């Protein structure tokens, strides 16, 4: 099975997986310097009010919140983006130091963190059907850097103890994403992929440019996860981020100038 070590990680994908070669892979660096300012990019609509979230679960790569998307409850539309989107889930990449762990860079920089707020086309019926679509999901990343505690992000950080191993999961009902949102809604929007297999080209990126500060003791939790199921020997699930990919033929734009 696919991971994040030397036997299984980023650089050994492309064997089960060929699309990991694509024209649209994810992550990218972005590079402010030559991403373009586009002024026909309207504000993002982000409609988190009515958000039902259901569950914690660890499957053996990161931690999902999953959330209820029998119904229009927590959208997001606007930007680039044509149509609603669904929320379905969000999840996380970190390191194992603070210096390593957003799946994007910025200049080449890295962040402690990379949160993923994944949301699904609603003309396409369900998710299965919106991830074989062009334009089925919209992705929003969140850059996580190390400095003062998130008080939202604390109710996601005390329920890791339940959901340790591999294939656990929790109730977790009445979370508000709305806590784990920056203040400005700045944005780089390009097409890409999902970033873990099957690495789908089915992606539009909106990545804010204003990170969300999380303590390092916050941050320490998430690094006391394990890949491994209950009775395995324990492995931490620490550096479950891919590294950035080629851009090729593609235009970043950024919604501010
Ligand atoms: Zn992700």
Redesign the pocket.
């Known amino acids: 099975h696919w991971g994040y070590g030397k036997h299984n990680g980023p650089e050994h994908w492309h064997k089960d997986f060929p699309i990991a070669k694509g024209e649209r892979q994810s992550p990218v660096d972005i590079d402010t310097h030559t991403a373009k300012y586009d002024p026909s990019l309207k504000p993002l609509s982000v409609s988190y009010d009515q958000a039902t979230s259901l569950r914690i679960l660890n499957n053996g790569h990161?931690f999902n919140v999953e959330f209820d998307d029998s119904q229009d409850k927590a959208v997001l539309k606007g930007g680039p983006l044509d149509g609603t989107y669904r929320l379905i889930e969000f999840?996380?990449?970190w390191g194992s130091l603070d210096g390593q762990g957003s799946?994007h860079t910025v200049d080449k920089k890295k962040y402690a963190a990379?949160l993923?707020l994944?949301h699904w086309n609603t003309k396409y019926g369900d998710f299965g059907k919106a991830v074989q679509q062009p334009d089925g999901l919209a992705?929003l990343g969140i850059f996580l850097k190390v400095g003062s505690a998130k008080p939202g992000l604390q109710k996601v950080v005390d329920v890791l103890d339940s959901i340790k191993t591999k294939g656990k999961s929790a109730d977790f009902t009445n979370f508000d994403p709305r806590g784990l949102l920056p203040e400005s809604l700045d944005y780089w929007t390009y097409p890409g992929s999902?970033?873990?297999p099957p690495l789908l080209e089915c992606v539009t990126w909106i990545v804010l440019k204003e990170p969300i500060s999380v303590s390092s003791e916050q941050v320490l939790k998430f690094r006391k996860l394990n890949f491994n199921g209950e009775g395995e020997p324990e492995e931490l699930m620490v550096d479950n981020w891919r590294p950035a990919q080629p851009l090729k033929n593609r235009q970043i734009k950024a919604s501010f100038k």
């Open positions: 990161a999840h996380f990449h799946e990379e993923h994944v992705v999902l970033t873990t």
